[PDB]
Amino acid sequence: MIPLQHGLILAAILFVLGLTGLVIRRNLLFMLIGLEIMINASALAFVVAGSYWGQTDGQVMYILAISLAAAEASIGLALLLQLHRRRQNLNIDSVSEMRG
Amino acid sequence: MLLPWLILIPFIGGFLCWQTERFGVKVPRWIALITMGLTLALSLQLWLQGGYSLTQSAGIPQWQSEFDMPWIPRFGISIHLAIDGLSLLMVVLTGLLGVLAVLCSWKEIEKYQGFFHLNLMWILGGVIGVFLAIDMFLFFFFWEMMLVPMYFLIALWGHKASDGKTRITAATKFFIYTQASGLVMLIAILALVFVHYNATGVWTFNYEELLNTPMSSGVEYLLMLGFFIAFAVKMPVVPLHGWLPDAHSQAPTAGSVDLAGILLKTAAYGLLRFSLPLFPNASAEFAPIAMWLGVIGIFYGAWMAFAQTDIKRLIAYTSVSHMGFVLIAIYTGSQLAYQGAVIQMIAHGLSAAGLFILCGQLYERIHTRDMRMMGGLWSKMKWLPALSLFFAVATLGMPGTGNFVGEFMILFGSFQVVPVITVISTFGLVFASVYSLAMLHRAYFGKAKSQIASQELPGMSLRELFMILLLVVLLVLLGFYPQPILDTSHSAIGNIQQWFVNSV
Amino acid sequence: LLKRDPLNSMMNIPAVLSRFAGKGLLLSENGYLRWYVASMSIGAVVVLALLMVLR
Amino acid sequence: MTITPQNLIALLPLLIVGLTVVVVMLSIAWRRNHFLNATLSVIGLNAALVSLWFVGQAGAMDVTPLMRVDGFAMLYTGLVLLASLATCTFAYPWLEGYNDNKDEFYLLVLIAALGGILLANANHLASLFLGIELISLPLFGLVGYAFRQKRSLEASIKYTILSAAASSFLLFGMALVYAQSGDLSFVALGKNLGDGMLNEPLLLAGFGLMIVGLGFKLSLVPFHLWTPDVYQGAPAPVSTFLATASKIAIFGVVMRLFLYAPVGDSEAIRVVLAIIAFASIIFGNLMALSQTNIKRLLGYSSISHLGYLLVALIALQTGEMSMEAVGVYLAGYLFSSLGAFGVVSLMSSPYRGPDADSLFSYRGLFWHRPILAAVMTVMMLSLAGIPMTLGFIGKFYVLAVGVQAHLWWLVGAVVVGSAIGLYYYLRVAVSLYLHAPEQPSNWQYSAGGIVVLISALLVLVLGVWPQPLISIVRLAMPLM
Ligand SMILES: CCCCCCCCCCCCCCCCCC(=O)OC[C@H](COP(=O)(O)OCCN)OC(=O)CCCCCCCCCCCCCCCCC
Ligand SMILES: CCCCCCCCCCCCCCCCCC(=O)OC[C@H](COP(=O)(O)OCCN)OC(=O)CCCCCCCCCCCCCCCCC
Ligand SMILES: CCCCCCCCCCCCCCCCCC(=O)OC[C@H](COP(=O)(O)OCCN)OC(=O)CCCCCCCCCCCCCCCCC
Ligand SMILES: CCCCCCCCCCCCCCCCCC(=O)OC[C@H](COP(=O)(O)OCCN)OC(=O)CCCCCCCCCCCCCCCCC
Ligand SMILES: CCCCCCCCCCCCCCCCCCCC
Ligand SMILES: CCCCCCCCCCCCCCCCCCCC
Structure with missing residues (x-):
């Protein structure tokens, strides 16, 4: 009784909001937060699609998605801590040394 | 069976020149001399045993000798060599110029001399492979293979008085011109092979089988344009000529590198063998454009040659105008104009070789190429100004030299085909006399315009003088008795002409 | 007029x-x-818009 | 489906690389020994190559709903394993200069090779996504392995953020595709369509977002801006792996996805990929024109060469030998990139610490490293598509495939980009032999030198005589 279009539109809205947060925020922590919003939105879209078809593959894709989300959040926060302890500054525009 | 050895003896000789540098610093020149002499001797033996004067025209294909061996059987690509009269004349000419290039690099004994001789031999073997290959991929492979040793000779062994970045710029311009034109030719080759594959069903790159491929007029015109662009870069045809005087000016200052790589004209042979037979209708439709490009090349090259203050650039633009004459000859349908084109190619090779060797000797005597810094050199040198007078007279189109024979047979046949273009081209001969006399007046006659010209200079060695006199004798004999060359190229030229005019 | 090669230029x-x-x-x-x-987001917009236009 | 013992035979390189990961990790847990753990890693990868021989002695079959093993998968597994072995060999002297722990490097290289093997056999959207992530996360570690250096930390942060964003794009596209088509297997993407309804808007949008993720991974325009910064900032063996193995594996799974999907022969996707290939060729060559840094130059070179590969992919659903062209080009590109990045790695090894400079300074390399200069100029000629090199054979295959499919814009793009490449590759190769004013002794450095020399010899020999490589690639065909 819940349309597939509505669930996919909700997932698309969350994905777009996470991408906007990734773009407009200069702090690296908020960039990681936007990345987490984007990957959670894509996982929600997989769950919506799997629930529409009555298949378990959507939740399996969700499980792989959140495995990726956990591991890359760990890596990104480790790199954030390294940047903080090497520069005392989380500005992502300051770490821009290599240029064309 | 001797054609693979005609290609392989330069490569093995270059490898042995590189390797035998450890045995002595003045060793690899003898190895290069021996291998170029072996290549010339094998070419002359193929000439003597071929019986080209008694051969009658029987239609394409008609090879005096042939060799085939599968190379990439997936695409139907094979090492497929063949020789007839035109290819034989070109192979003898490049063997002779290779011997002259080895002798011109004598008494230049530095470190990594063996690699210089390796690059020279690989250029010569690539030129021979261009003249011998009769399948499309092997022809393209030899066409592009010469450019790497040529690039490194210009960039690393080039004109030592330059900035160093000018040599790299000239070599890069040459390489980009020739390799991009080659890639356009490769696209045309691949499209022709695919048209044949769709028409018949079998992969082939063989030139004999790719003849009479049924295709529409537009597709044939496009394939002809790709082939013509590749040949027009190396002919040179204006405006694609600009690499040539920069490559000549920044070449290694012995002058041997010019004779080895820049002086010979594989593009006129390429037009004759792969443009008229493969696309006869397209060449027939393209003929007015090509002939007007030849006229523009004649006059533009003469005007550019007059305006130079450097001798090497003057000789380069002289080459541009002569190749304009040859390009006019090719797109007519005359056996007489084709024979004149063959004689003019050989005569241009001999006369440009003499001019470039004499310019190198003059530069190593006076340490400048600016004609504003030299003058009155007839009274200061022993042999060089008189031989330079002879070779400027030869490039002028003087009867008694083979340049006259080639140019006037071109003009006779072209007047039988296209009279207006012939009239304009003979006025181009007047302009040729103008620039030859301008060079002679600025360089050797008058008062000395600098302190370096107001001194007695050492005479030429016996080796340089004897090879220049050999070129003089060859040009005079070609002017007075050109009949053996005509009888050699007659059957192949007749085959090309009868294929070109009977299919239109 | 031609002493600096115009066609080469x-x-x-x-x-x-x-x-x-x-x-x-x-x-x-x-x-x-x-x-x-x-x-990357601009390229995503362009690719999606091209795919929707071409259909 | 269940896993029969024959299916276990077909998973042999994957099993051997996973077992090597476990064994190397337990050896690190025993004692931190650089030589033993590097040796165990390279032994595991060589055992995976011999297991590829054993897989070839078996059949070609679908080992899972997820994996399909065939000659295609075997060829890409071999390419990934060769790239990983070369990366370990180049890594040992560089890590010998390193000061911190230097065995987690080999663990991460093994896990990235495992992801490359999974992408080589990937027949499913789940296996594609998992293989991309198994390639990506160890590369997050490897690019910032020398994180005390500013450039490596910068490249690590850029690569991590952008690859997480691209994985989000790819996953959202997969979710939209799964919303349209009820199956996640490659052969069922667009299967439930007909009568000219192949261009379903949701399916095209999902493939567009997947194209965004994969084109980030392949450095295709306009998802290419990360490439020179990450290539310059990463350690040089990491740059070798990132240039060869990641690109080869991801392009192989893209090739199989476009071969098997019924939406692969879509006009809209073909036109979009043609635009991306044109822009990639022209932009990579144009941006590499004025580069004095060799690693940025090779990054832009990778952009243009992946553009040529994409041109070969566009003609896949029309012609036949596009797979053969991709195989030959990928072999040549692998060997050329291994030689070039290995020369860059050998002259930058041992590691000089985070404080010292790491510029290559290739001018006048011949007068103190003549063999490496010869290898580097052979590789520069090969990346330029010069005849007598295998790079020309790949370029000839790309041109023939484009001419057969009447892709004239892409053919002209290849010609123009090749001319621009001629300029900058020849600039590097001739700067190798000039004169520079101013500015080893172990068998692993010699092993790296032997690797770059064998790559140069393979490039020259297979450029002169390319029939064995063509014959090898032609018998490595997937299930039709
Ligand atoms: C970085 C910036 C700079 C670098 C990039 C610059 C641009 C590079 C690209 C330039 C070339 C563009 C494409 C030229 C080819 C166009 C092909 C074409 O229009 O084909 C249409 C048609 C095909 O034939 P079709 O009609 O199908 O045949 C069946 C029945 N006739 O064709 C025909 O019917 C025949 C058409 C013949 C005339 C068109 C070809 C013109 C070629 C121009 C160059 C040569 C000019 C003459 C020679 C000058 C000296 C070399
Ligand atoms: C010399 C030319 C250039 C070579 C470059 C190679 C680059 C890629 C390397 C890996 C390529 C693997 C390609 C394998 C394709 C096999 C396709 C196939 O169907 O093979 C089947 C065949 C057995 O035949 P069949 O009877 O058909 O089997 C079915 C029976 N149920 O079974 C086979 O064919 C088995 C194949 C086994 C391959 C083992 C490879 C071992 C590793 C060799 C590395 C050499 C060094 C290279 C690096 C040098 C240094 C950088
Ligand atoms: C910058 C350099 C590179 C320039 C870009 C690359 C070349 C562009 C060529 C454009 C060609 C446009 C063709 C337009 C029509 C296409 C559709 C068609 O009907 O093609 C005709 C034909 C296939 O139709 P079919 O019924 O099978 O006929 C077989 C017999 N021809 O088609 C065929 O049979 C094959 C057609 C081949 C077309 C020519 C390919 C060779 C190109 C030569 C060099 C480029 C053109 C000249 C130089 C321009 C300036 C650089
Ligand atoms: C007559 C029309 C019909 C026939 C057309 C035939 C086309 C193929 C044959 C002609 C090709 C012409 C190429 C012209 C440029 C040659 C390269 C060159 O001049 O390089 C030298 C120059 C470096 O020297 P410099 O300027 O001092 O240094 C600046 C950097 N520090 O280098 C540079 O400045 C940068 C060089 C960049 C790379 C070279 C340019 C490539 C451009 C595309 C090539 C294909 C063109 C297709 C046709 C276009 C229209 C004619
Ligand atoms: C066919 C292979 C082409 C690419 C390899 C080129 C390198 C070959 C081996 C090295 C030779 C270098 C010679 C350098 C001579 C420099 C002389 C400078 C002063 C004149
Ligand atoms: C900045 C670099 C730009 C490079 C552009 C290269 C363009 C090459 C020429 C392409 C010509 C394509 C012609 C296609 C004609 C198709 C006609 C089909 C009729 C059915």
Whole structure:
């Protein structure tokens, strides 16, 4: 009784909001937060699609998605801590040394 | 069976020149001399045993000798060599110029001399492979293979008085011109092979089988344009000529590198063998454009040659105008104009070789190429100004030299085909006399315009003088008795002409 | 009038255009990660819009 | 489906690389020994190559709903394993200069090779996504392995952020595709369509977002801006792996996805990929024109060469030998990139610490490293598509495939980009032999030198005589 279009539109809205947060925020922590919003939105879209078809593959894709989300959040926060302890500054525009 | 050895003896000789540098610093020149002499001797033996004067025209294909061996059987690509009269004349000419290039690099004994001789031999073997290959991929492979040793000779062994970045710029311009034109030719080759594959069903790159491929007029015109662009870069045809005087000016200052790589004209042979037979209708439709490009090349090259203050650039633009004459000859349908084109190619090779060797000797005597810094050199040198007078007279189109024979047979046949273009081209001969006399007046006659010209200079060695006199004798004999060359190229030229005019 | 080769120059002008286009394209490599994310999102918009237009 | 013992035979390189990961990790847990753990890693990868021989002695079959093993998968597994072995060999002297722990490097290289093997056999959207992530996360570690250096930390942060964003794009596209088509296997993407309804808007949008993720991974325009910064900032063996193995594996799974999907022969996707290939060729060559840094130059070179590969992919659903062209080009590109990045790695090894400079300074390399200069100029000629090199054979295959499919815009793009490449590759190769004013002794450095020399010899020999490589690639065909 819940349309597939509505669930996919909700997932698309969350994905777009996470991408906007990734773009407009200069702090690296908020960039990681936007990345987490984007990957959670894509996982929600997989769950919506799997629930529409009555298949378990959507939740399996969700499980792989959140495995990726956990591991890359760990890596990104480790790199954030390294940047903080090497520069005392989380500005992502300051770490821009290599240029064309 | 001797054609693979005609290609392989330069490569093995270059490898042995590189390797035998450890045995002595003045060793690899003898190895290069021996291998170029072996290549010339094998070419002359193929000439003597071929019986080209008694051969009658029987239609394409008609090879005096042939060799085939599968190379990439997936695409139907094979090492497929063949020789007839035109290819034989070109192979003898490049063997002779290779011997002259080895002798011109004598008494230049530095470190990594063996690699210089390796690059020279690989250029010569690539030129021979261009003249011998009769399948499309092997022809393209030899066409592009010469450019790497040529690039490194210009960039690393080039004109030592330059900035160093000018040599790299000239070599890069040459390489980009020739390799991009080659890639356009490769696209045309691949499209022709695919048209044949769709028409018949079998992969082939063989030139004999790719003849009479049924295709529409537009597709044939496009394939002809790709082939013509590749040949027009190396002919040179204006405006694609600009690499040539920069490559000549920044070449290694012995002058041997010019004779080895820049002086010979594989593009006129390429037009004759792969443009008229493969696309006869397209060449027939393209003929007015090509002939007007030849006229523009004649006059533009003469005007550019007059305006130079450097001798090497003057000789380069002289080459541009002569190749304009040859390009006019090719797109007519005359056996007489084709024979004149063959004689003019050989005569241009001999006369440009003499001019470039004499310019190198003059530069190593006076340490400048600016004609504003030299003058009155007839009274200061022993042999060089008189031989330079002879070779400027030869490039002028003087009867008694083979340049006259080639140019006037071109003009006779072209007047039988296209009279207006012939009239304009003979006025181009007047302009040729103008620039030859301008060079002679600025360089050797008058008062000395600098302190370096107001001194007695050492005479030429016996080796340089004897090879220049050999070129003089060859040009005079070609002017007075050109009949053996005509009888050699007659059957192949007749085959090309009868294929070109009977299919239109 | 011809002493500096005009045909050589009008064949040299593709090299001038290539150098100018390369210098212009190198302005996108400014080293800013937010611009790299923004360019990825711009490319996503362009690809999706092209696919919707072409259908 | 269940896993029969024959299916276990077909998973042999994957099993051997996973077992090597476990064994190397337990050896690190025993004692931190650089030589033993590097040796165990390279032994595991060589055992995976011999297991590829054993897989070839078996059949070609679908080992899971997820994996399909065939000659295609075997060829890409071999390419990934060769790239990983070369990366470990180049890494040992560089890590010998390193000061911190230097065995987690080999663990991460093994896990990235495992992801490359999974992408080589990937027949499913789940296996594609998992293989991309198994490639990506160890590369997050490897690019910032020398994180005390500013450039490596910068490249690590850029690569991590952008690859997480691209994985989000790819996953959202996969979710939209799964919303349209009820199956996640490659052969069922667009299967439930007909009568000219192949261009379903949701399916095209999902493939567009997947194209965004994969084109980030392949450095295709306009998802290419990360490439020179990450290539310059990463350690040089990491740059070798990132240039060869990641690109080869991801392009192989893209090739199989476009071969098997019924939406692969879509006009809209073909036109979009043609635009991306044109822009990639022209932009990579134009941006590499004025580069004095060799690693940035090779990054832009990778952009243009992946553009040529994409041109070969566009003609896949029309012609036949596009797979053969991709195989030959990928072999040549692998060997050329291994030689070039290995020369860059050998002259930058041992590691000089985070404080010292790491510029290559290739001018006048011949007068103190003549063999490496010869290898580097052979590789520069090969990346330029010069005849007598295998790079020309790949370029000839790309041109023939484009001419057969009447892709005239892409053919002209290849010609123009090749001319621009001629300029900058020749600039590097001739700067190798000039004169520079100013500015080892172990068998692992010699092993790296032997690797770059064998790559140069393979490039020259297979450029002169390319029939064995063509014959090898032609018998490595997937299930039709
Ligand atoms: C970085 C910036 C700078 C670098 C990039 C610059 C641009 C590079 C690209 C330039 C070339 C563009 C494409 C030229 C080919 C166009 C092909 C074409 O229009 O084909 C249409 C048609 C095909 O044939 P079709 O009609 O199908 O045949 C069946 C029945 N006739 O064709 C025909 O019917 C025949 C058409 C013949 C005339 C068109 C070809 C013109 C070629 C121009 C160059 C040569 C000019 C003459 C020679 C000058 C000296 C070399
Ligand atoms: C010399 C030319 C250039 C070579 C470059 C190679 C680059 C890629 C390397 C890996 C390529 C693997 C390609 C394998 C394709 C096999 C396709 C196939 O169907 O093979 C089947 C065949 C057995 O035949 P069949 O009877 O058909 O089997 C079915 C029976 N149920 O079974 C086979 O064919 C088995 C194949 C086994 C391959 C083992 C490879 C071991 C590793 C060799 C590395 C050499 C060094 C290279 C690096 C040098 C240094 C950088
Ligand atoms: C910058 C350099 C590179 C320039 C870009 C690359 C070349 C562009 C060529 C454009 C060609 C346009 C063709 C337009 C029609 C296409 C559709 C068609 O009907 O093609 C005709 C034909 C296939 O139709 P079919 O019924 O099978 O006929 C077989 C017999 N021809 O088609 C065929 O049979 C094959 C057609 C081949 C077309 C020519 C390919 C060779 C190109 C030569 C060099 C480029 C053109 C000249 C130089 C321009 C300036 C650089
Ligand atoms: C007559 C029309 C019909 C026939 C057309 C035939 C086309 C193929 C044959 C002609 C090709 C012409 C190429 C002209 C440029 C040659 C390269 C050159 O001049 O390089 C030298 C120059 C470096 O020297 P410099 O300027 O001092 O240094 C600046 C950097 N520090 O280098 C540079 O400045 C940068 C060089 C960049 C790379 C070279 C340019 C490539 C451009 C595309 C090539 C294909 C063109 C296709 C046709 C276009 C229209 C004619
Ligand atoms: C066919 C292979 C082409 C690419 C390899 C080129 C390198 C070959 C081996 C090295 C030779 C270098 C010679 C350098 C001579 C420099 C002389 C400078 C002063 C004149
Ligand atoms: C900045 C670099 C730009 C490079 C552009 C290269 C363009 C090459 C020429 C392409 C010509 C394509 C012609 C296609 C004609 C198709 C006609 C089909 C009729 C059915």
